[PDB]
Amino acid sequence: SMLTELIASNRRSAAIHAFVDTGLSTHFKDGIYVDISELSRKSGVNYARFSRLCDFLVEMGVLVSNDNKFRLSDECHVFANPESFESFMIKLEICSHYSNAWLMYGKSLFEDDGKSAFEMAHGRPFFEYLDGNKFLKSNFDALMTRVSNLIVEKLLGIYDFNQHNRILDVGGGEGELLVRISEKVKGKHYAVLDRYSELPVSDNIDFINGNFLNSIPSGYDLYILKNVLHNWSDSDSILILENFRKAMDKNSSLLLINMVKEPEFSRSFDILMDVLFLGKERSFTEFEYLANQAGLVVQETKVIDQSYSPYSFIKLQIK
Amino acid sequence: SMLTELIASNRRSAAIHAFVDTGLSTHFKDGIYVDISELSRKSGVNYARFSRLCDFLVEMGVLVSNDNKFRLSDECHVFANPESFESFMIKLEICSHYSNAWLMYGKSLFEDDGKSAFEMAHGRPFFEYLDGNKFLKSNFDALMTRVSNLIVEKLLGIYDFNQHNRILDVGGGEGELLVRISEKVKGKHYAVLDRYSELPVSDNIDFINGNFLNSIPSGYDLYILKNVLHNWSDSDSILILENFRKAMDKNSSLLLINMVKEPEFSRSFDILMDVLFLGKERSFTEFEYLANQAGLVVQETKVIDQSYSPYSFIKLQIK
Ligand SMILES: Nc1ncnc2c1ncn2[C@@H]1O[C@H](CSCC[C@H](N)C(=O)O)[C@@H](O)[C@H]1O
Ligand SMILES: Nc1ncnc2c1ncn2[C@@H]1O[C@H](CSCC[C@H](N)C(=O)O)[C@@H](O)[C@H]1O
Ligand SMILES: COc1cc(OC)c2c(c1)C(=O)c1cccc(O)c1C2=O
Ligand SMILES: COc1cc(OC)c2c(c1)C(=O)c1cccc(O)c1C2=O
Ligand SMILES: [Cl-]
Numbered sequence: 001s002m003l004t005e006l007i008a009s010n011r012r013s014a015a016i017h018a019f020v021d022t023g024l025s026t027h028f029k030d031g032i033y034v035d036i037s038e039l040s041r042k043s044g045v046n047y048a049r050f051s052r053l054c055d056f057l058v059e060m061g062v063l064v065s066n067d068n069k070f071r072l073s074d075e076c077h078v079f080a081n082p083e084s085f086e087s088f089m090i091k092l093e094i095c096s097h098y099s100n101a102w103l104m105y106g107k108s109l110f111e112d113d114g115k116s117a118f119e120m121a122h123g124r125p126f127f128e129y130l131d132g133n134k135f136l137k138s139n140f141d142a143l144m145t146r147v148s149n150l151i152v153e154k155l156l157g158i159y160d161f162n163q164h165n166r167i168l169d170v171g172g173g174e175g176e177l178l179v180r181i182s183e184k185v186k187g188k189h190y191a192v193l194d195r196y197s198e199l200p201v202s203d204n205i206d207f208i209n210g211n212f213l214n215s216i217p218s219g220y221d222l223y224i225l226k227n228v229l230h231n232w233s234d235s236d237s238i239l240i241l242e243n244f245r246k247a248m249d250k251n252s253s254l255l256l257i258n259m260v261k262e263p264e265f266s267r268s269f270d271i272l273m274d275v276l277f278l279g280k281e282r283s284f285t286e287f288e289y290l291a292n293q294a295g296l297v298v299q300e301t302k303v304i305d306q307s308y309s310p311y312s313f314i315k316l317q318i319k
Numbered sequence: 320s321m322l323t324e325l326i327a328s329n330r331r332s333a334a335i336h337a338f339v340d341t342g343l344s345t346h347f348k349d350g351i352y353v354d355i356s357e358l359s360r361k362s363g364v365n366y367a368r369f370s371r372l373c374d375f376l377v378e379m380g381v382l383v384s385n386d387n388k389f390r391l392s393d394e395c396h397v398f399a400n401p402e403s404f405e406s407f408m409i410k411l412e413i414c415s416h417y418s419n420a421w422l423m424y425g426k427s428l429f430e431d432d433g434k435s436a437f438e439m440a441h442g443r444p445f446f447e448y449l450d451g452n453k454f455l456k457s458n459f460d461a462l463m464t465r466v467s468n469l470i471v472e473k474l475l476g477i478y479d480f481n482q483h484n485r486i487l488d489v490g491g492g493e494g495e496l497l498v499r500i501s502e503k504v505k506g507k508h509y510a511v512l513d514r515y516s517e518l519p520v521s522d523n524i525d526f527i528n529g530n531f532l533n534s535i536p537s538g539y540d541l542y543i544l545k546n547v548l549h550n551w552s553d554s555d556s557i558l559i560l561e562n563f564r565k566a567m568d569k570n571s572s573l574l575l576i577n578m579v580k581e582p583e584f585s586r587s588f589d590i591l592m593d594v595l596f597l598g599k600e601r602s603f604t605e606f607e608y609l610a611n612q613a614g615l616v617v618q619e620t621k622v623i624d625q626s627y628s629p630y631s632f633i634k635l636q637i638k
Contacts, residue, residue: 003394004627006379007409009331011587014421014594016326022425045428049593053428056586060325075322090326099418102329106337109364109372267375268330274368275333308323 013094015056016079020090024050025072025079033069085146085308091139097122097129098276105275114233117275126231126276127195141174148176148226151257151311154304158313159255161185164222168193170212170244171228175205178224191220212240216247223248226257231277234290241294241316248318254296260284260303260312269309284312295319332413334375335398339409343369344391344398352388404465404627411458416441416448417595424594433552436594445550445595446514460492467495467545470576470630473623477632478574480504483541487512489531489563490547494524497543512536531559535566542567545576550596553609560613560635567637573615579603579622579631588628603631614638 040047104117175192191206273279300315359366494511592598623630
């Protein structure tokens, strides 16, 4: 039926995970047709049982069956690349920590202690827990780096970064965004603020160990906050934007860049942000409200089309 | 995109789980429109955060939204009933034990020890592990009971049970099938064989602690094996049917009743059987082959339509 297979939606994620996490998908590069019997003899995977997985991947539209062989669909070519953001996504999506967080989601809706389903499961908030877990941190930081890399060319196209002198990326992670921006926009001061136990090292990048809940460093004319606010509540989001306003002068600009809530696209990510952070994916209207409460003004709004989600580009200045 | 939401299929299962497992769905009985504002005040669930879950349930088609009120869809009325098989399904579907089994599925394809992904995760095969886990056993046995209670009406309609005298349901669990048959077909001897640490109790039902891998007891003219063989390999399936042939005389009949693999329906269940049991969902042809290898003859075959899956009804007698 439609209901029982909807209940069994997890099986689709788990099937893809088995195919990608093992590295079996990396044998399907450049849309080649793979003989499963030969792949079985080479990789030492069970032929009969992997053939049944491939049949389910064909049903999902991940594989295509022709000439008694299988190729990745045009869309699913990314699964052949273990460096792709999709490879890191599935590795996190149904990992034990995420799964155990989802199992506390129901109970978390009845609590008023400000503890996420993740924290209820693991005993710390997401980012504080990642400090002690290499698997979660490395794979998450990798995912953020890959999606940062994808939007760079689009972001440089719609806004002039050359007019600016000193640029700070707040919660910039490994600092991929500014590293790629600096290669095309030379002769600027580049800084990246995040939570570092050991400062990253990159040519002409000033890596800052800071806390955007406490303070943002002043004396930059361009600030960037990309995919941060949907990890935070309304009050924490206002506190962050308030710290920007206190750091910014009249000439300063803040580029608030976020995966934006649009009715056409799935609410699934909005729920994931609730489970992991007690966060939420916000519309343009909700982002504008929080900015106004912090004493910031919207001077420019654009929509950036990415494969996986639409993005809201919001240029903020002090009132 | 379609690919990232296919990767994130697990979020659909986890959302339904949080809605049903908490018992919030039990407030949506008889297709009534629920005020989330009132349900929040009454049950103590977070209004804003549950309203967001409801929006995701509307997207999935589980809920219908009209004038800022939510009702269960005609199809998902079952979620209002905690005794429904769908309620038990989701509670098992993404439970930690199933999730941890799925995480070993990839690695299990490279092993050849006859150990399921579940056994690799938990250290014991499924049913042996259920002996020491009441949560899994009680919910699994409850699920098998609910689906047994659904098919009884159609099964009585297509086969004359009144011709028989002594009836044994092999691997009959809580014995729901025969209890329901015995109410409509009176004056017979009814027996249920399964693995019991303590024998269940029901009026005019002889519960037997047995092992169908070792032996099936002789002296019955009707044998029933319903949804057993897809927990077993081809060799173990043959061993079970061989034990039937040894137990049966020329006058005996075996009813092999199973969810049947048809090309129109999903392969997702076939993969679940591999993960949990190293089992498989078989076609009519594959079932007939195993019976022929065991020394049994097919007298009569029929298809029984159930909401969630088609069933293969196969009447067998000895060669
Ligand atoms: N209190 C805090 N102070 C500074 N950075 C924080 C923080 N809490 C979380 N972060 C960082 O916020 C980031 C959110 S993920 C976004 C990373 C990057 N801006 C990108 O778009 O790809 C993580 O790198 C996390 O380490
Ligand atoms: N070795 C064994 N001997 C007997 N029963 C067994 C067994 N291994 C598993 N079983 C039982 O086989 C059943 C599979 S589930 C099917 C239950 C029932 N026939 C129905 O259709 O609803 C479980 O009740 C399990 O306890
Ligand atoms: C910062 O919080 C996030 C947290 C996130 O998940 C915990 C994500 C993302 C952000 C995210 O940007 C993203 C983009 C594309 C695919 C994804 O799976 C994600 C994503 O999972
Ligand atoms: C005995 O092995 C099973 C094992 C099973 O799962 C472990 C199931 C079933 C059988 C099963 O029959 C079933 C029917 C309808 C919905 C279901 O989720 C199931 C099911 O999960
Ligand atoms: Cl008796």
